[PDB]
Design a protein around this ligand. Structure first.
Ligand code: ATP
Ligand code: ATP
Ligand code: MG
Ligand code: MG
Lengths: 432, 429
């Protein structure tokens, strides 16, 4: 069994502590450190803990044996991790657990022979530290696809990719992004659950290795005004009966009906999905015209950088690139929301709007309402109100998770709206 | 095959990452870092990337080199890539593809151009992690240590290059403080351009390791010598040097005169490519080793084009106008196209101005028909725009991007209020 293989790795690597890793509703990693003597108890009846932390009472941690990994930073004593699912004391799964929510939505898709594969493009910033505290000052003075010595973070990015490969992770490519100190690490495509586990691991690894070098890695959507913001472009494809359900060689543009319907479904609920995929108040400072980030609700081919883009590759690589999410979203909930909205498009038979190949930003406002082009929410409150009314996403994510998202977002918005920012003093104090 | 040899070097040296290297229209190196697991995919169907839309990187197997500075023992490697459209057609906007096209067109007439550049550069100090224009040493022409403090770093630069199949001739301290020169042997225009990009990357990387900043800027300091890229050039027809004619006067063939005549006819336009920055025209001023007047002569006078004394296989012309901030792929392509038009149409060059030129008065220079190189970047771009031969040789895509980038820089520079103006007028007016 897998448990026997875990204990073999324990004695070989001299693992003394195990971290029972899990995630709250906001995508923040949480854990319980246990000595290796308690590992047999963790894999058997499980470890008890207070679960008010998930919301961000008594519950149990159920480690997934497939996620056992030794943390490649040695302490002679090594450490290991285990991604755990949350269960209630009786044995039933906790429907407030984000990982359980994605698992449920994937099981509902598997009922119709569908499996969703996701391949995200993870953008992030590497900032300097001042007096032990993190800052928003770029550590390098680099640009798009730049090379060293312009890109000063080549050693740390090299370490991130190596540390990930040591944890059964396959990376496609990494490069410097448009903004100063911005970087991108694109992963290979995998099932929504393995990808979401991998997304959490990347954020943890990048932030840990950045600290080791006196730096701070952040996946914040818009840490600096006037420069490009970090996005999480999600390459998505559906696979029915082993074949790519988005490929039809006889149809026009070799795109199947299931693609156009899936696109139609996700665009129907995209205002509501934005509350999950763009959950911070800062996420809406990224959804501003002038940068790679999509703002208008449109879909097109590769030539135009729209919200949903259908790349040229065909065959087994047929896919859609949803470019609205940012890397601060909870990946378990982001993929669950996209899967539920996209499957409603396939099931309820929803035709998507006409593809817009013209440059949207170059068009005038007068032409956009003629074609029925909408806008993504401008504020967090505006997306939360749209999410509140979308009963499909509320039922797909569960009432417990949906309520927790609304409560956390409203608490942040009510605090942000009352604040007096420096911009207001700079604009009005001297004159008025 | 070469792919099998690459994978043998991978397991031998323990390469874990490879750099898919390429250059933009301005000669700046760009890359995509991939783990060694994706190397089979890169050498096969290629790696996709956003050029802005989407494109594919096609690595040149002959350019696979292990970076001598070891990784965390995880070795690292690099591959110079050609850009290509998704369907399979080479991208006409790629600078390396432009030189390759101009090379094939020369090869159809049995011609192969060999280039040997003299790379001048500066080594400056760093203040608070930012680069400065303060020389690291207070050395002069051909000076020796301890006057030349960069003797250890230059020795490391040459060593690192030799480890990557690089053959160099000599290195020395130049006229200005903290200025140096590294001259390497002659090779075909493509290998030389690849080597020029590698030289800049290696020097800047090694300088940062020592807390210094290497720069190939044409004129980083006012009042001192500027960095130049003197390009030794020669054509080879059917294995032999097309510039050597033992029966002709001065042992120089008609092909040399016609090639010189062609490059001097389009030299105003070539200046926009070989001297592409606004700062490049602060180097093209009298008083330093940089040529200003459009003339050609023997080794006695320092002119735009100089015919050195060596004959035989070493017969060549030294084009001294370029600076090391130019895109080498486009600089050599522009030289080859203008030079081949001279050969093809038999354009005679002007008389060799052996008389010392800077000392002559403007009135005489006007009588002899001696012209001048463009004084500003805008002036060179206007001349480049009208040169139909060069626009067609570099392609409309590349020519348009050069004009856009240069105009955007010029329009920003011309509106700026520099400190010189405040120092000259604020107190009095
Ligand atoms: N079917 C798919 N579903 C989701 N994402 C995909 C899919 N195919 C490709 N991608 C994403 O696109 C990126 C690269 O696209 P590409 O055109 O190379 O297809 P590919 O499947 O990655 O090719 P290969 O199988 O050789 O790796 C990958 O990083 C991956 O995340
Ligand atoms: N035929 C040629 N074409 C272009 N450049 C040349 C040629 N011959 C020499 N050069 C360049 O001129 C410089 C000085 O050449 P030199 O007088 O030493 O003759 P050389 O021995 O043939 O040089 P090299 O050893 O580099 O071939 C060298 O750096 C070289 O790159
Ligand atoms: Mg993208
Ligand atoms: Mg010289």
């Amino acid at each position: 069994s897998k448990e026997d293989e875990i204990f073999r790795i324990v004695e070989e690597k001299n693992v003394r502590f195990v971290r029972l890793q899990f995630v709250d509703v906001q995508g923040i990693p949480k854990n319980v450190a246990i000595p290796v003597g308690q590992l047999e108890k963790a894999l058997g009846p499980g470890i008890h803990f207070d679960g008010s932390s998930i919301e961000g009472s008594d519950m149990v941690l159920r480690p997934d044996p497939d996620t056992f990994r030794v943390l490649p930073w040695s302490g002679g004593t090594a450490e290991a991790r285990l991604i755990c699912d949350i269960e209630l004391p009786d044995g039933k799964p906790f429907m407030g657990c984000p990982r359980q929510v994605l698992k449920k939505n994937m099981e509902e898709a598997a009922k119709l022979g569908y499996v969703m594969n996701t391949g995200p493009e993870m953008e992030f910033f590497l900032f300097k530290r001042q007096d032990g505290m993190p800052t928003n000052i770029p550590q390098d003075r680099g640009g798009y696809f730049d090379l060293a010595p312009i890109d000063l973070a080549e050693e740390i990015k090299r370490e991130i990719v190596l540390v990930l490969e040591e944890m059964g992770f396959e990376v496609e490519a990494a490069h410097h992004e448009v903004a100063f100190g911005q970087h991108e690490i694109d992963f290979k495509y995998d099932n929504a659950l393995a990808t979401a586990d991998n997304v959490i691991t990347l954020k943890y690894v990048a932030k840990t290795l950045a600290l080791q070098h006196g730096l701070h890695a952040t996946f914040m959507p818009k840490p600096i005004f006037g420069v490009n913001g970090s996005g999480m472009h999600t390459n998505t494809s559906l696979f029915k009966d082993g074949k790519n359900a988005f490929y039809d060689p006889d149809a026009p543009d070799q795109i199947s009906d299931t693609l156009r319907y899936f696109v139609g479904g996700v665009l129907k609920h995209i205002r509501a999905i934005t509350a999950i995929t763009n959950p911070l108040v800062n996420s809406y400072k990224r959804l501003v015209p002038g940068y790679e980030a999509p703002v208008y609700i449109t879909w097109s081919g590769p030539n135009r950088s729209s919200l949903i883009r259908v790349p040229a590759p065909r065959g087994n690589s047929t896919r859609i690139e949803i470019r609205s999410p940012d890397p601060s979203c909870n990946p378990y909930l982001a993929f669950a929301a996209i899967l539920a909205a996209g499957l409603d498009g396939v099931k309820n038979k929803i035709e998507p709007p006409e593809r817009v190949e013209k440059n949207i930003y170059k068009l005038t406002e007068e032409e956009r309402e003629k074609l029925g082009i909408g806008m993504l929410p401008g504020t967090l409150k505006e997306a939360i109100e749209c999410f509140k009314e979308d009963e499909l996403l509320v039922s797909a994510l569960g009432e417990h998770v949906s309520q927790s998202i609304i409560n956390v977002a409203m608490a942040d918005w009510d605090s942000y709206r009352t604040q007096v920012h420096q911009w207001e003093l700079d604009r009005y104090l001297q004159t008025y």
